[PDB]
């Protein structure tokens, strides 16, 4: 259509890049995904020492004519903290920074699958219909934007149609469990002392329970859930629906990154069922986010937590709860006391006593 | 692996999530613009409760809890504030000046342009493009063209007036602010000029401010026909000429200005054009000057970690959809030398950018 003092103009001019940085956030996603697609971290690691740009391009099957673009991509990734670069000719050479441990294929805790899963069309595309879903009232409505953009299908049904996407999700969860469980049994050692049995609800391939069982040789761990499963003498598996099937009895019931996927109604119903079972008393163990906890209250951590809340809002049916929200559920479910112990990775352990 | 190493890696993991979940920032901001949140709150005139805000955005009351969560995200990003009254009430933060429709410097169009399918999608073919040789005939100058059946962006703009309008409006909004900073912080750069050609000057926001601030300077914006045939800034000492800077003669002037233009293009055509400017700027023994309003990637004014992060993000954006980069001082100085220039001066302006005066 048709078509301020200097100090104010400069201030506003200088404020723009903060906005650009926000709306160009997808550039971080896509640059990281490229690094993974190209196996950059692995190729550098295989080299065994800093690798010159030309040799890196060659190993990546990037034409020498495009090495300058590879160089710019590396500069971005160095800034993100994955790699380092130096110029040994008076021609950059690249090596690994500590954050790259999380990209290496050889590490069972690498984040490759979660990355591919997270930036997949399945999870990004629905956001272009988020405004419409938000404005949809109650027969065109769906539980979330994901379903809104997948003809009514929630993520679990889409997982059953898309084996690759499903595999990425599971591998991504398994990778996190590898690291989280090792931090959990160390940071929260006292929470496992005294137990003879634990049920790991949504425990999947048993990565969490394997570590508990190996660390605390007297705990009989049972994974209760809907690749080959981890083996341990004190680790077994039971098939079931946590919402509509009865949870096996044990000294402790564990929910690792599970309750965050669901809204208060089905969570409360399940907790009430857990309170009945756990009562001689056992205890509830929740390894998950307490959004406003002191241990993750710094702005960087809060930013990432809130980003997860948005991610979950779009494709799951849960959220990252505050202590107040958790405490209300515990109270309503009939539990009497809880104790929070920080673990790491934005998450804590909540022990809840019936 | 000992426990301490496991905890350290577990605590480093969220940095990675934050990286790959970057698009959530993009999409939450775009939602805020789609929903007109800033404008609706501003029009309300004072902090607005959650339930009233839902109604004002035509979000059903049953979806208010989701709106609350989106606002919590946007408050953290710094666009809005939550005002404590004892439901949450919401108000505007300083950053929201850049979202309001009534401000001629708002960043709405640039945001929509930037997160558009045209610019996001080619990234899913970046690895394939990087691995493409100039032999099997599938090569293109960048991933954008690779993903657009060989079409480059300024071609897509001449054919797609909507996306094109987003991009030119986006540039205009920045120019509105940048030009006001420029004439203030670099006032001396305009001394003694009687003419200036703003090459790729768009819809004239830059030259309009130059012309008003420096009455002796006749300003000519030189851009493509589809950019300067519509509404644009007007002034008695400002006019527009159309053409292609690579194939047509640039208008003669005491100063040649490139604002956010040289960064779109690779060294070879940039050098050729700078050589042309050096010749033009030294005709008949009299010397003009070259002015570049652009990124100097390693300049002190944008050397901090946050600024550098945004510069490199732009370098990536430009790599995908343009044919240029954010050049370091080393890269610029080499071009100046090869083009035949004899001196330069760099003065910071703002928004990651500087003025380079280049003298023949
Ligand atoms: N071949 C060409 N000849 C002249 N202008 C061109 C061109 N190719 C692209 N452009 C123009 O260069 C500009 C780049 S974006 C910069 C616009 C303006 N200087 C500003 O800073 O706000 C666009 O207006 C685009 O239309
Ligand atoms: C010659 O044009 C320079 C382009 C600058 C630009 C800056 C930020 C953007 O988001 C963006 O997205 C389109 C473009
Ligand atoms: C699909 O991508 C993600 C999923 C989760 C889910 C956690 C608990 O269900 C956490 C982080 C991610 O990036």
In SS3 terms, chain B reads as: CCHHHHHHHHHHHHHHHHHHCHHHHHHHHHHHHHCCHHHHHHHHCCCEEHHHHHHHCCCCHHHHHHHHHHHHHHHHHCCEEEECCCCCEEEECHHHHHCCCCCCCCCHHHHHHHCCHHHHHHHHHHHHHHCCCCCCCCCCCCHHHHCCCCCCHHHHHHHCHHHHHHHHHHHHHHHHHHHHHHHHHCHHHHCCCCEEEEECCCCCHHHHHHHHHCCCCEEEEEECCCCCCCCCCCECCEEEEECCCCCCCCCCCCEEEEECCHHHCCHHHHHHHHHHHHHHCCHHHCCCEEEEEECCCCCHHHCCHHHHHHHHHHHHHHHHHCCCCCCCHHHHHHHHHHCCCCEEEEEEEECCEEEEEEEC
Strand-pair category, A83-87 with A92-96: antiparallel
**Ligand 1 near B292 CB (within 6 A):** no
Q: What is the resolution of this structure in A?
A: 2.0
Question: Which CATH fold would you assign to the domain B1-99?
Answer: Arc Repressor Mutant, subunit A (1.10.10)
B245 marked as binding residue: yes
Contacts of B72 in chain A (CB under 8 A): 306, 309
Separation CA A266–CA A253 (nearest Å): 17
Separation CA A188–CA A341 (nearest Å): 7
B332 Rama sector, left if φ>0, alpha if ψ -120 to 50, beta otherwise: alpha
Name the nearest CA neighbour of B293 among B205, B212, B230.
B205
Q: What are phi and psi of B296, to 5 degrees?
A: -110, 105
| Residues sharing a CB contact under 8 Å with residue A285, sequence separation 6 or more, in sequence order | A191, A198, A252, A253, A254, A255, A349, A350, A351, A352
Give the closest ligand to the alpha carbon of residue A305. Answer: 3
The answer to whether B180 contacts A306, with C-beta atoms less than 8 Å apart, is no
Beta bridge partner(s), residue A126: none
The 10 Å CB-count burial string (b at 16+, else e) for A55-93 is ebbebbebbeebbebbbbbbbbbbbbebbbbeeeeeebb
CA dihedral sign of residues B199, B204, B208, B209:
negative
A42 SS3 class: helix
What is residue A232's DSSP assignment?
B
The answer to whether A73 contacts B316, with C-beta atoms less than 8 Å apart, is yes
Q: How far is the CA of B145 from the centre of ligand 2 (A)?
A: 17
A284: its two tokens: 């509830």
A334: its two tokens: 């009939």
Domain at A1-103, CATH from 3.40.50.12140, 1.10.10.10, 1.20.120.530, 3.30.460.10? 1.10.10.10
Element (H, E) at A19: helix A6-23
Q: Could you tell me if B245 and B228 are in contact, meaning their C-beta atoms sit under 8 angstroms apart?
A: no
**Break sites following residues in chain A (C–N > 2.5 A):** 3, 90, 138, 226, 279
The answer to whether A1 contacts B231, with C-beta atoms less than 8 Å apart, is yes
Best of A1, A7, A16 to disrupt the B interface by mutation (most B CBs within 10 Å)? A16
Domain with CATH 3.40.50.150 in chain A: 104-354
The 10 Å CB-count burial string (b at 16+, else e) for B102-112 is ebebbbbbbbb
A96 SS3 class: strand
Q: How far is the CA of B355 from the centre of ligand 3 (A)?
A: 45
Separation CA B324–CA B335 (nearest Å): 14
Separation CA B177–CA B190 (nearest Å): 18
A17 → closest Cβ in B29, B114, B351? B351
Give domain B100-360's CATH superfamily: Vaccinia Virus protein VP39 (3.40.50.150)
Q: Could you tell me if A267 and A329 are in contact, meaning their C-beta atoms sit under 8 angstroms apart?
A: yes
Number of neighbouring beta carbons within 10 Å of residue B4: 10
Q: Could you tell me if B207 and B172 are in contact, meaning their C-beta atoms sit under 8 angstroms apart?
A: no
Give the closest ligand to the alpha carbon of residue B201. Answer: 1
Q: Could you tell me if A286 and A349 are in contact, meaning their C-beta atoms sit under 8 angstroms apart?
A: yes
Domain with CATH 3.40.50.150 in chain B: 100-360
Q: How far is the CA of B98 from the centre of ligand 1 (A)?
A: 23
Separation CA A132–CA A208 (nearest Å): 39
A345: its two tokens: 């990775």
**Whole-Å CA distances, A69 to A11, A19, A66, B112:** 33, 26, 5, 26
CA A146 to chain centre: 17
Domain with CATH 1.10.10.10 in chain B: 1-99
Name the nearest CA neighbour of B206 among B171, B236, B230.
B171
What are the E-state strand segments in A53-172?
Answer: 83-87, 92-96
Q: Could you tell me if A289 and A347 are in contact, meaning their C-beta atoms sit under 8 angstroms apart?
A: yes
Angle at A91 (CA atoms; ends A85, A96), nearest 5 degrees: 25
Method: X-ray
Domain with CATH 1.10.10.10 in chain A: 1-103
CATH class of A104-354: alpha beta
A263: its two tokens: 């809204």
Best of B177, B182, B328 to disrupt the A interface by mutation (most A CBs within 10 Å)? B177
Question: Atom of ligand 1 at shortest distance to CA of B201?
Answer: 19
């Amino acid at each position: 259509g048709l078509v301020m003092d200097a100090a104010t103009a400069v201030e506003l001019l200088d404020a723009q890049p903060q906005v650009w940085h926000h709306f160009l956030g997808y550039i971080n996603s896509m640059t990281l995904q490229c690094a993974l697609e190209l196996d950059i971290a692995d190729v550098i690691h295989r080299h065994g020492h800093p690798i010159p740009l030309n040799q890196l391009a060659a190993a990546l099957e990037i034409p020498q004519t495009k090495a300058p673009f590879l160089s710019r991509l590396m500069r971005m990734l160095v800034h993100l903290g994955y790699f380092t670069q130096v110029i040994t000719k008076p021609l950059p050479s690249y090596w690994l920074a500590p954050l790259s441990r999380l990209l290496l294929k050889q590490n069972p805790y690498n984040a490759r699958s979660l990355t591919f899963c997270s930036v997949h069309e399945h999870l990004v595309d629905p956001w272009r219909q988020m405004s419409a879903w938000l404005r949809t009232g109650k027969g065109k409505d769906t539980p979330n934007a994901f379903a809104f953009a997948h003809e009514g299908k929630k993520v679990y049904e889409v997982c059953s149609e898309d084996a690759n996407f499903s595999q990425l999700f599971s591998e991504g969860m398994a990778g996190d469990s590898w690291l989280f469980s090792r931090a959990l049994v160390s940071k929260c050692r006292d929470a496992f002392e005294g137990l003879s049995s634990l049920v790991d609800v949504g425990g999947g391939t048993g990565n969490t329970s394997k570590v508990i069982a190996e660390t605390f040789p007297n705990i009989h761990c049972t994974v209760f859930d809907l690749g080959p499963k981890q083996t341990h003498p004190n680790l077994d598996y039971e098939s079931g629906n946590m919402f509509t099937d009865e949870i096996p009895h044990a000294d402790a019931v564990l929910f690792k990154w599970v309750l965050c996927d669901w809204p208060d109604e089905p969570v409360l119903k399940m907790l009430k069922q857990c309170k009945k079972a756990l009562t001689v008393k056992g205890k509830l163990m929740i390894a998950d986010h307490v959004l406003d906890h002191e241990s993750c209250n710094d702005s960087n951590s809060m930013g990432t937590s809130l980003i997860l809340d948005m991610l979950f809002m779009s494709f799951l049916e849960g959220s990252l709860r505050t202590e107040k929200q958790w405490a209300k559920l515990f109270a309503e479910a009939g539990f009497k006391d809880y104790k929070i112990t920080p673990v790491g990775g934005l998450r804590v352990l909540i022990e809840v006593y019936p």
